[PDB]
């Protein structure tokens, strides 16, 4: 009120709402996984000039094993990060397998010197694709030596990017530092070329009920209280909408059950007080709020009187009847009376009376009183003019 003194009455104040307890996430637990095991357990890689390209789809491109695996030592992502890879989706990933010199790790960097780079396989200067390099010397090394991967492709004429020497003595487990073969996995992804269909797995949490919580089903976010429902969705239907076009029922991806959504309770708060003259005691009203739940958590309380208007605290309920003093609602009024305290009761409409009506009786007055009464009516309000400019 921006004042140091408040007149008798009932006044509005801040709003009241229930905060969510925690967050819950549910997703359709994965059963389709890409055959990464067989992908990286290949007995022998193909020719360098015939590097494979396997488009990956209809299968989750899980990367946790990569993080979990301790075999990998070098793992750099120059375009993304593993932390945000959880909520980042790639349209499609191509698994490209080839055999390259161990010392060419330095020259594989995009936009790096060395004509060997574009002589064997040119990389675009903006190739931010992550490169995985885990030692596989014994796995991809033979006792005699891999002479198949000849590197005599030293043609003078340069080969344009997608226009349409023999320094390898043998890949053996005894190879020295920088010469041992290393398995290379190419993370190639594109944008705005096809709908996203390959993503990392998303974890799930146990379902809860009867708690104002934050939920996220298949990208549908909100806040509410989850509960079992008898609605019978169709086999191909997922959500439920009301006439106002607001979500009111969802189907859990994992367990095919229909759960209702109800907003967390909230309502306004008001303060009832007599004039600051008489006292400073007050009583608060919670508009349209359940009463026997808030006190579960005026710390003493000891005065809770449920009413159709909502929970009421600080006033004692007396079952007499008087005229309305500070209206509350639904035929309830509060007033200050003595042992001074605030009381709440049911308003009285007036004193009972019963006319002694008959069929041969009439009453006639004997004399009179002249009465004078007033009446106040507004007539006009102060003029006012304003200069717009």
Partner 1 sequence: PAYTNSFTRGVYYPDKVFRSSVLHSTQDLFLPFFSNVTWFHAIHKRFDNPVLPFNDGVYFASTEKSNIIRGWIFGTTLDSKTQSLLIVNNATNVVIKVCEFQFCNDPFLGVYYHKNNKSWMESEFRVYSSANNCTFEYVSQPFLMDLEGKQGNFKNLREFVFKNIDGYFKIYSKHTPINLVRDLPQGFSALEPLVDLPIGINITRFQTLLALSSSGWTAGAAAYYVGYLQPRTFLLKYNENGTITDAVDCALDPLSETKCT
Partner 2 sequence: MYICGDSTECSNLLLQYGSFCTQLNRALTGIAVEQDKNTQEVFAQVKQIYKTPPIKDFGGFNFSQILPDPSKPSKRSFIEDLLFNKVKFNGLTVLPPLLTDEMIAQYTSALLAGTITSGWTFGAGAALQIPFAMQMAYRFNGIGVTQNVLYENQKLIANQFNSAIGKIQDSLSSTASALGKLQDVVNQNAQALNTLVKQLSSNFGAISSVLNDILSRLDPPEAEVQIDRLITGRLQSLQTYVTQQLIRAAEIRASANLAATKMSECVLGQSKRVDFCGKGYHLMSFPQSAPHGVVFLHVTYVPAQEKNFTTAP
Ligand X SMILES: *[C@@H]1O[C@H](CO)[C@@H](O[C@@H]2O[C@H](CO)[C@@H](O)[C@H](O)[C@H]2NC(C)=O)[C@H](O)[C@H]1NC(C)=O
Ligand Y SMILES: *[C@@H]1O[C@H](CO)[C@@H](O[C@@H]2O[C@H](CO)[C@@H](O[C@@H]3O[C@H](CO)[C@@H](O)[C@H](O)[C@@H]3O)[C@H](O)[C@H]2NC(C)=O)[C@H](O)[C@H]1NC(C)=O
- The site for partner 1 (CB under 8 A) is made up of 55, 57-58, 194-195, 197, 231-234, 236-241, 243, 249
- Cβ atoms of 182 and 98 closer than 8 Å: no
Nearest approach, Cβ of residue 246 and partner 1 (Å)? 12
CB of 82 to ligand NAG, least distance (A): 30
Closer to ligand Y by CB, 83 or 206: give it. Answer: 206
The residue nearest ligand X at its CB is: 37
**Widest pairwise Cα distance in the chain:** 139
CB of 113 to ligand NAG, least distance (A): 31
Task: Name the β-bridge partners of 270.
Answer: 12, 285
User: Which residues are at the interface with ligand Y (CB under 6 A)?
Assistant: 29, 31, 232, 254-256, 356, 359-361, 363
The candidate with the shortest Cα–Cα distance to 270, out of 6, 5, 9, is 9
Residue from 239, 263, 294, 322 touching partner 2 (CB under 8 A): that is 263
In the list ligand Y, ligand X, partner 1, none, the entry touching 237 (Cβ below 5 to 8 angstroms by class) is partner 1
Identify the residue among 14, 277, 380, 389 touching ligand NAG (CB under 6 A). 277
Among residues 6 and 116, whose Cβ is nearest to ligand NAG? 6
Which position has the token pair 């007050």?
A: 282
Closest C-alpha to 268, from 11, 1, 9: 11
DSSP string of 291-346, one letter each residue: TTTGGG---S---B---TT--EES-EEEEEEE--SEE-SSS-EEEEE---EEEEEE
Minimum gap (Å) between residue 5 Cβ and ligand NAG: 5
Contact pick of 5, 58, 367, 374 for ligand NAG (by CB under 6 A): 5
**What's phi and psi for 50, nearest 5 deg?**
-120, 45
Task: Please tell me whether residue 195 binds partner 2 under the rule CB under 8 A.
Answer: no
* Minimal distance, residue 230 CB to partner 1, in Å: 12
CA dihedral 286, 292, 297, 298 (to 10 degrees): 60
| Interacting partner of 355 out of ligand NAG, partner 2, ligand Y, none (Cβ under 5 to 8 A depending on kind) | partner 2
Piece of 96-104, 269-277, 323-331, 361-369 that binds ligand NAG (CB under 6 A) = 269-277
Burial zone of 106 (CB within 10 Å; 0-12 exposed, 13-18 middle, 19+ buried): exposed
Q: Phi first, then psi: what are they for 120, rounded to 5°? A: -90, -55
Other beta carbons less than 10 A from residue 265's beta carbon: 16
Q: How far is the CB of 27 from ligand Y (least distance, A)?
A: 10
Output the smallest distance, CB 57 to partner 2, in A. 24
Q: Are strands 316-322 and 341-347 parallel, antiparallel or unpaired?
A: parallel
Between 157 and 361, whose beta carbon lies closer to ligand Y?
361
Residues numbered 218-237 forming contacts with partner 2, rule: CB under 8 A: 221, 223
When asked if residue 319 is in the footprint of ligand NAG (CB under 6 A), the reply is yes
Helix spans in 76-157 (H):
82-85, 116-120
| Min dist. Cβ of residue 235 to partner 1 (A) | 8
Distance CA 70, CA 88 (A): 24
3-class DSSP assignment, residue 118:
helix
- Sheet (strand 74-76) strand order: 74-76, 131-135, 182-186
Given ligand X, partner 2, ligand NAG, none, residue 277, with its beta carbon under 5 to 8 Å by kind, binds: ligand NAG
Residues at the site binding partner 2, with contacts judged by CB under 8 A: 12, 15, 17, 221, 223, 243-246, 263, 266-268, 287-288, 308-309, 327, 329-331, 347, 349-382, 384, 386, 388
């Amino acid at each position: 009120l921006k004042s140091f003194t408040v007149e008798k009455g009932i006044y509005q104040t801040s709003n009241f709402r229930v905060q969510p307890t925690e967050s819950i996430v549910r997703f359709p637990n994965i059963t389709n996984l890409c055959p990464f095991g067989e992908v990286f357990n290949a007995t022998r890689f193909a020719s360098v000039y015939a590097w494979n390209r396997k488009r990956i789809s209809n299968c989750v491109a899980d990367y946790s094993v990569l993080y979990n695996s301790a075999s990998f030592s070098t793992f750099k992502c120059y375009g993304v990060s593993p932390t945000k890879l959880n909520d980042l989706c790639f349209t499609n990933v191509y698994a490209d397998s080839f055999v390259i010199r161990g010392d060419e790790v330095r020259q594989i960097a995009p936009g790096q010197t060395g004509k060997i780079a574009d002589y064997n396989y040119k990389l675009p200067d903006d190739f931010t694709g992550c490169v995985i390099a885990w030692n596989s010397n014994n796995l991809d090394s033979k006792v005699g030596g891999n002479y198949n991967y000849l590197y005599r492709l030293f043609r003078k004429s340069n080969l344009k990017p997608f226009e349409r020497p023999l320094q390898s003595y043998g890949f053996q487990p005894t190879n020295g530092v920088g010469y041992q073969p290393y398995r290379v996995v190419v993370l190639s992804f594109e944008l705005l070329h096809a709908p996203a269909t390959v993503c990392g797995p998303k974890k799930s949490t146990n379902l809860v009920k009867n708690k104002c919580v934050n939920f996220n089903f298949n990208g549908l976010t909100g806040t509410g209280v989850l509960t079992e429902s008898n609605k019978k969705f169709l086999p191909f239907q997922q959500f439920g909408r009301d006439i106002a076009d607001t979500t009111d029922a969802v189907r859990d991806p994992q367990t095919l059950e229909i759960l209702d959504i109800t907003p967390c309770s909230f309502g306004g708060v008001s303060v009832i007080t007599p004039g600051t003259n008489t006292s400073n005691q007050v009583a608060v009203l919670y508009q349209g709020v359940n009463c026997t739940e808030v006190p579960v958590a005026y710390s003493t309380g000891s005065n809770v009187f449920q009413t159709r208007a909502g929970c009421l605290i600080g006033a004692e309920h007396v079952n007499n009847s008087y005229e309305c003093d500070i209206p509350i609602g639904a035929g309830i009024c509060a007033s200050y009376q003595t042992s001074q305290s605030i009381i709440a009761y049911t308003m009285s409409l007036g004193a009972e009376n019963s006319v002694a009506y008959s069929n041969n009786s009439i009453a006639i007055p004997t004399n009179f009183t002249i009465s004078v009464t007033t009446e106040i009516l507004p007539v006009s309000m102060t003029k006012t003019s304003v200069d717009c400019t």
